[PDB]
Amino acid sequence: VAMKKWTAPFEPFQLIDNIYYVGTDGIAVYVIKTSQGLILMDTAMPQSTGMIKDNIAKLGFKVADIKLILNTHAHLDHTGGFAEIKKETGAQLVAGERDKPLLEGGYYPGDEKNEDLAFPAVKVDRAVKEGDRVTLGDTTLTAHATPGHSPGCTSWEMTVKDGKEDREVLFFCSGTVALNRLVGQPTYAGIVDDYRATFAKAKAMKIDVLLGPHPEVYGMQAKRAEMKDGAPNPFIKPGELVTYATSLSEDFDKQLAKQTAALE
Ligand SMILES: [Zn+2]
Ligand SMILES: [Zn+2]
Ligand SMILES: [Zn+2]
Numbered sequence: 014v015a016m017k018k019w020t021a022p023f024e025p026f027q028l029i030d031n032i033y034y035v036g037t038d039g040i041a042v043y044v045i046k047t048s049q050g051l052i053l054m055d056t057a058m059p060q061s062t063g064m065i066k067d068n069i070a071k072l073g074f075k076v077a078d079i080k081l082i083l084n085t086h087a088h089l090d091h092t093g094g095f096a097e098i099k100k101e102t103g104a105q106l107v108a109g110e111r112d113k114p115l116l117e118g119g120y121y122p123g124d125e126k127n128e129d130l131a132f133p134a135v136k137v138d139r140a141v142k143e144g145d146r147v148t149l150g151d152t153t154l155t156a157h158a159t160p161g162h163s164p165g166c167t168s169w170e171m172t173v174k175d176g177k178e179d180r181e182v183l184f185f186c187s188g189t190v191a192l193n194r195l196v197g198q199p200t201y202a203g204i205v206d207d208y209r210a211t212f213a214k215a216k217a218m219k220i221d222v223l224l225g226p227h228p229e230v231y232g233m234q235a236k237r238a239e240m241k242d243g244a245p246n247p248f249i250k251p252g253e254l255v256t257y258a259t260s261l262s263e264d265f266d267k268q269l270a271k272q273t274a275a276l277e
Pocket of ligand 2: 187
């Protein structure tokens, strides 16, 4: 999948207000335009960095203007371009504190010898905790600790305009089980409790626009196809995070049961 949908092209676009989609057909990456430079939200696979840089350019944004790189979570499909872009731009990397060891080592937790899941190691300039505010110029994002998919998985909240009114955006960090081990030798200590706390947290947030590190988190392609001038922004769907977190919780139960049965 990493060399299929995850590397397939998608045309960059203005998603809402100062948030621009610059990812691929299978990995979501965002530029947030501020009055004092750009924030880059995530990157893609290590081999896709040039592609992401080209997408930023298609919008007329300058890679050189990136001041901050923020991470949702520290897996190679989101961190693959951090070392390269950080060195090129002098940007600072901001990430959840418990993902710092993963970022700085370039490894998958609980599977550290797996070179196919490695990525170029990168230093974290600011390690964030719940409620920390990251500001560049006119723009502030708030960190929310939503661990499970990774130990330092961070969901980022910010306010945008839709016409004259405020709308709340969440870059949800991911809540899938994916490659993680939940029992036996869990991927990290306390993983199960983290996931279940995160589903509850997500369902309690008041979020107008759900975003995520893969477009399938929020059905990006269907919304993009419906978008046009003089029609409501299809990315505004305030009920979506509750619905999505409910689906994630149901799949989590299925995987926990499957992995528990496999222990025998
Ligand atoms: Zn991941
Ligand atoms: Zn991912
Ligand atoms: Zn929070």
